[PDB]
Design a protein around this ligand. Structure first.
Ligand SMILES: COc1ccc(O)cc1-c1c[nH]c2ncc(-c3cncc(C(=O)N(C)C)c3)cc12
Length: 258
């Protein structure tokens, strides 16, 4: 854990994006810096990121956890968040096969988290980052430890991103890897629509009531049928009926390789 420990003066802040674009001076490397949510939570978040090693999860580079202010230093993704990237892109370049490639990368990251007993709890396009050549990485700053068979119960009075949130979470504050699968389905929809807002115009207070009566978003324009079938599978009411990320990733790698 001290192999990760850095001196605060090894980094220089360049631009404020509390997240900064910074420079790891020794390597002349552009990095992302997060500074200090309570202290212990921040330190645990750093501790968890030390255990994460995957090409499509944002890589930790070092921490400053001796004397305040505390730093978490990670790799820098050139193009920023996926949501704005999709909304502002050239769709002739970011075409159908690129969208499949992005979904494959994200599902690969989630398959890793699934295998390593982590949940994300805020899977969404706004929380994915884009590098050169349509490289996509999931932000892993809010990861929680959880055995995949088990359930996390959010604290009393927690506020959710309703339109990304699984029904069991909206009603009972319960989260699991299956609730991430639901969120992934919404992320797929975001990708397929190049960053449209989910359930357009639908009042937030009626989303749960709609879901329990089996309302789901319709197939986006131009979206392949098999991709929509995957979305719908992710949106099964019963969590145990939803596919695993291993199955989801396998499905996308097949599509992408064909
Ligand atoms: C300390 O790392 C983090 C902690 C919090 C957070 O939200 C993200 C990062 C993070 C890591 N690597 C990154 N690489 C690139 C960018 C980034 C660059 N430029 C623009 C945007 C952006 O979309 N907006 C400002 C809306 C994001 C962020 C990051």
């Amino acid at each position: 854990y001290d192999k990760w420990e850095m001196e605060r003066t090894d980094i220089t802040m360049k631009h404020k994006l509390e997240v900064y674009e910074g420079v790891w001076k020794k390597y002349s490397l552009t990095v992302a810096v997060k500074t200090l949510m309570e202290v212990e939570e921040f330190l645990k978040e750093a501790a968890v990121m030390k255990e994460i090693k995957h090409p499509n999860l944002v890589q930790l580079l070092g921490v400053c956890t001796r004397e305040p202010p505390f730093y978490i230093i990670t790799e820098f993704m050139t193009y920023g968040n996926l949501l704005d990237y999709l909304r502002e892109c050239n769709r002739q370049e970011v075409n159908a096969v690129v969208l499949l490639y992005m979904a494959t990368q994200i599902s690969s990251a989630m398959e890793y988290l699934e295998k390593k007993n982590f949940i994300h709890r805020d899977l969404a396009a706004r929380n994915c980052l884009v590098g050169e050549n349509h490289l996509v990485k999931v932000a892993d700053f809010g990861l929680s430890r959880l055995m995949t068979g088990d359930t996390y119960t959010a604290h009393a009075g927690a506020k959710f991103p309703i339109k990304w949130t699984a029904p069991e979470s909206l009603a009972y504050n319960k989260f699991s890897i299956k609730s991430d699968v639901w969120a992934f389905g919404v992320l797929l929809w975001e990708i397929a629509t190049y960053g449209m807002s989910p359930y357009p115009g639908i009042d937030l207070s009626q989303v749960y009531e709609l879901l329990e009566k089996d309302y789901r978003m319709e197939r986006p324009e131009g979206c392949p049928e098999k991709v929509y079938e995957l979305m719908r599978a992710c949106w099964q009411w019963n969590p145990s009926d939803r596919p695993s990320f291993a199955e989801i990733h396998q499905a996308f790698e097949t599509m992408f390789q064909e």
